[PDB]
Each structure stands twice: as C-alpha cells, then as structure tokens.
Amino acid sequence: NEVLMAFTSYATIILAKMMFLSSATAFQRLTNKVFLRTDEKVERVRRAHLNDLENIVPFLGIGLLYSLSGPDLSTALIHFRIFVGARIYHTIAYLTPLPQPNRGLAFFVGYGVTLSMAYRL
Amino acid sequence: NEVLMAFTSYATIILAKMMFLSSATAFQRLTNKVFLRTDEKVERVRRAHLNDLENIVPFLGIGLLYSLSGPDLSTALIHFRIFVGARIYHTIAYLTPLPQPNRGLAFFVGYGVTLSMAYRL
Amino acid sequence: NEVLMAFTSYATIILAKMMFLSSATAFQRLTNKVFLRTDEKVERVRRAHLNDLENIVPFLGIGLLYSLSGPDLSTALIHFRIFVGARIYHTIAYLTPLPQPNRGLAFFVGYGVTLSMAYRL
C-alpha cells in the first residue's frame, strides 16, 4: 500500500496548500500603501498561506523521509490514512479559524507519526 | 531518465534558492532600529528569499513525491525538463519583478505537473 | 549506511524544528493588539520558528533529493554524519543568537553538501 498511500496524500499537499496560495492572490486592496483591508486581507492571506504550508514542511518532508524505506503495510494504511487523515481535516480545521482548535491536532501528528516513523525503523 | 532528471533539477533548488539567501545576507542597513533602506532592502531580501523558496516547497516536494514511484521515461524527460524548465526561467522571471508576469507561470506548473503526477499514477 | 543515515537525521528535523514550533506556541502576551513582549516574544518565536525551518527546506529537501539514488557508503557515513552533523549543532548554534556565528556554518553545508550531492552523481 505504500503505493496508493503516498499518493492520495501528496495531491492534497499541492492542492490543499496550492489550491490556496493562488486563491489568495491579490483580489486587490484599493492600494496606495506600497510607496480595513490590508492587514485583515493579509491577516487572512499570509496567515492562511502560512498554515497550509508548514503543517506540511516537516509533516510531509518527514512524510517521505520515512517511507523512503517503505514500511510493512498492515500498519501503513492506518498511519498514513490517519496520517494525511488528520492533517487534511486539520488543514480544513485551522485555516478557517486562527487560534486553539487546531494547534492541538497539529501536535499529535507531526510529533507522533514522526517519532513513530523514526522509531519503527 | 528519472536518473538525470531529478538531478539537474535539484541543484538549482539549493543554488537558485540558496545561491540567493546568502547573497541576501546583511550588506547591512545603517542600523539603529532593532531596539530608504530597511523596507526596500528587506522588500527585496525577504520578498526575494520568500519566492525562490515556496515556488519549491510544494513544487519540489511534490517534485519527488511522485517520482518516488519512478515513471515511464519518454514523457518524463519532458514533464521534468518542462518541470524545472519553467520554474527555473520562472524563478529568474519573478525575483526580478514582484507582481503579475510570474504568478501566472507559477500556476500552470505547480497545479498542473502535480494534478498530473497525481493522476498519471 | 544510507539505511541508518537518512534516519538519525530526519528525526531531528521534526524534533529540532517541530519540538520547537509548539514550545513557541502562545505563552500569551497580555494581548490587546489584534483589533516589551509582542515584538521581543515574536522576535524570539517567529525569528526562531523561521530558522529551525529553512535551514532544512533546502538542506533536507536536497538531503534526500540526492540519496534518492543512494550513494556508495564509505563517504556517505561522513557526508551525512557531517551533514546533519553541523546543521544539528548549527541549529543549536543559531536559534540561541541571531546574527553572525551561524550564517557562516549554514553556508558550508547547504551550498556544499549540495554542489557535492549534485556533482558526485
């Protein structure tokens, strides 16, 4: 299954993340300041383009850094279905808000799945 | 060719990106503010170190996330020569400016090559 | 050894980096400004969550981008023990300070190990 698994995953990582950077592209502020919106459009955009992102930078980096020596398989459907599993839902969880209800979910995964994928090997 | 291909590629990604972070290192502002330049040096540096970067974070992350199950080869010289192909030229395209003439080019690649490298498999 | 090597490495990259993002999580400023601390807590946090990070984004990205065609082995214990080797010590080096004593160490590695891992192949 390291076959299918790596897959469904990644597509969400250029999609989730990337379906999102461009939709964050300048539906421009009435600009003057280069020489209500700005912050609270940026405060969505930057703050949104930030968290799609990093939630991957380790998460996904590690996401292979491990499978690079491709596991058994009975676990791996889980730890990888669970793996993206959260982080998907999670990405959907956090971009919407900004504060608490995600930092939590972002912790059990990146720290865990990684200590695991370290250890297990 | 997944041989040669991954290669020429990556080198540009620590070079392009990284030949660039250090050349962005502090040819210092006449500093006072830590306790014309600042913004418009940062507005080059941060704004330049930002876009070398992400244009990879997915792009390249995915760039393997796919080849990890190494394709045929008759396509792959293209989709990977075209792959870096743009993004090279592209990186050269965007860092220079800041606004429109690149966001475009950055879209057909990261979104495409990725839906593809998702699909094809 | 591309076996063991990739390994010890990565774990430090979700740990180093990630053991660190969450410990950077809001031991909140006495907040008012959303509508001494802020900057100098952020100036630690953002400025700390930034440099764990990128010191990997290429470094580690490339870190595999190469081993993806897994080297000999007599060199590889070095170039990879030396590889994380610095960057570990280095990450420990830079987050603590902010200015000079690291940018240096960050250069010989990311630029080198990468031109190398380009070339050698």
Ligand SMILES: N[C@H](CCC(=O)N[C@@H](CS)C(=O)NCC(=O)O)C(=O)O
């Ligand atoms: N520090 C607050 C808010 C920062 C914030 O909630 N932004 C999120 C993104 S939407 C962020 O930068 N998080 C990245 C991180 O957790 O390091 C402010 O400056 O007003």
Ligand SMILES: N[C@H](CCC(=O)N[C@@H](CS)C(=O)NCC(=O)O)C(=O)O
């Ligand atoms: N938002 C504008 C300019 C921002 C800008 O053009 N910077 C580019 C980098 S050179 C950027 O942050 N782009 C990253 C992105 O597209 O998310 C400002 O604050 O004056």
Ligand SMILES: N[C@H](CCC(=O)N[C@@H](CS)C(=O)NCC(=O)O)C(=O)O
């Ligand atoms: N530019 C200075 C300080 C910036 C700084 O030292 N922050 C470090 C992180 S702790 C940084 O952003 N480095 C990232 C980089 O080198 O591009 C300021 O605005 O006061």
